Amino acid sequence: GICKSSDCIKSAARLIQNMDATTEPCTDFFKYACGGWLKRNVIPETSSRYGNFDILRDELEVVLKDVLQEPKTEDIVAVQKAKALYRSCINESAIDSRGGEPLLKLLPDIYGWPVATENWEQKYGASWTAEKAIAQLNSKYGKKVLINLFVGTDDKNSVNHVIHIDQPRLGLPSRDYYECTGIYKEACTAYVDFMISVARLIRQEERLPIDENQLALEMNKVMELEKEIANATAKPEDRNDPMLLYNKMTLAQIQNNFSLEINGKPFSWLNFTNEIMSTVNISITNEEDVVVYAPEYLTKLKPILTKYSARDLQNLMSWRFIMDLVSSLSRTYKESRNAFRKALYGTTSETATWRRCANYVNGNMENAVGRLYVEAAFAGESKHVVEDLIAQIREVFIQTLDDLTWMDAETKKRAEEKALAIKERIGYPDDIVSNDNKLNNEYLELNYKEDEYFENIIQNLKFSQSKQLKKLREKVDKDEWISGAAVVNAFYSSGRNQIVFPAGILQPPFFSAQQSNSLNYGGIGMVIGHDITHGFDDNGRNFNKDGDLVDWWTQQSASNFKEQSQCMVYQYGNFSWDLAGGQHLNGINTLGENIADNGGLGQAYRAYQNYIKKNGEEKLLPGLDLNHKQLFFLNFAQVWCGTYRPEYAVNSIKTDVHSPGNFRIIGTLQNSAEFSEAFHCRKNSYMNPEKKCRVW
């Protein structure tokens, strides 16, 4: 009766080893499905979180090591530069011998770092301008400080690019940290102690007199400046609706509305925008359209930067860039970083050098490392099987529209328009394997020296930023993938109306051609539904079938969506996370991902029921009293098995737009009538409550 094939057994073993059958599925399904995993596994010293995703990403890093470390004579140019970059990164001897020499060479190009400079006012401060200072970091190194000017896809014309103006990403994980009291006092102290440590080492390098009280004063001033900038930034709750965010206006208007006075000299946006864009030979006039995402920030910024000199501002601007570079320097500089990462993430040790490097080259040469990965790990024939499952779930999503009692039939037709217009990107672009020319031409502008890691990373910062600003006048590439192939994740692009499933997630426990379809639908099936559902989530649902920010919702169907989805906002809002000192989840920040989980699992289950009706049942797995209907739900839960450090649990609640592992399982299965039926759970039990939140 039951299956007895190697791939059936591997499934059973993993399923049994992970689950704890001495717990009631109706009392706590997380502790039921993962209890076995929790008992055996402990968070590694280098990790802040650990689970199925983080184990697979660590298993993916091993595969990247194997290919990058060993050269081959048959390898093309694009590959050689990837492997050369890896060898340059892992050579500790070569890096350590330089010390902070590469940084001292670079500081002059970014108008120096005043705290670790002598007579700065005369050297730079004299002929210093807010435009050229912020523009250098932005244009040369891709570092956005005070003003975050970048070039991206236009929300109302998804084929066109346009200059965006937004608030900058802060030094600490979220604006919430800059209170610096209670749970944040630890991090804020370490952050300023990290500033001083790096400042001290640079002065020792330059042979200047170390005055401890002068370092402490100047760097607490940098903390004071960033506290004001942090307070001026809008909360994630006020950036949820993209219609209220998108505010297109010309540079002419921006100068009239959002004028600034930095170090006496009034700020010129025309001079500033050109200083950046002139790097790639493109002229900007006052009649240039600019999507301002943070108008309230710029308004609040005016009175902040009027009471701070060029010194105080360049101390922050230079520090914010140095902070990133520290990990590309000697062990002496990396020591000060690891101290700060203990307070923030809870990690007692530094990530293995070969793991940091494998990921760095994978991030700066996606297609090159993607080729090496899919050549080794990924099959290729599996791409056919996934394409079918996506088509099945896409149809199952449309089938559900007719059943929905809160959408008028005109909005249902417009929802089917987007649903059928969703493009699917599976595994990898076939270009990187077959077409060698295109791949070599991508990294042609890059020349790496094996004994010059810091010059290599600074080169990659130019190549990246240059590649982006180039696109301002270009029609967006429809063929260009958003993610590389060597990634354990899955994405949706609102701008392209595109679902993406890299080769990294097309593996157990999510998908395998051999393993039971129950597990496939429970794993990848839910993920496919999730990223489809992102097309119609709180942000997702404001974008048409061409990925344009246009309203296609009736004032009743829209009003209903809010009313219906407000359920999940309250549900997840009423979850106290023990690992984060019993703080409640931000139900508004997590809504988008929560909607996608609840929608995806439901869509995935129906797609499996359509498979049951069409293909009948399949041989059960050994050593398990669970039937095929349950193994679907068990596999879904085992996807999210894992635990967090308290230091990063705090970090997670404020930043992460995802709910933590345990509540993604509980939250959705509480809202699943099919789960309660499959596991025969009584009404009023914790995993089967009366009120059930539903959207898709």
Binding site: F53, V488, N489, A490, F491, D656, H658
Partner: peptide
């Protein structure tokens, strides 16, 4: 995104 599914995870971070």
């Amino acid at each position: 995104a599914a995870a971070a």
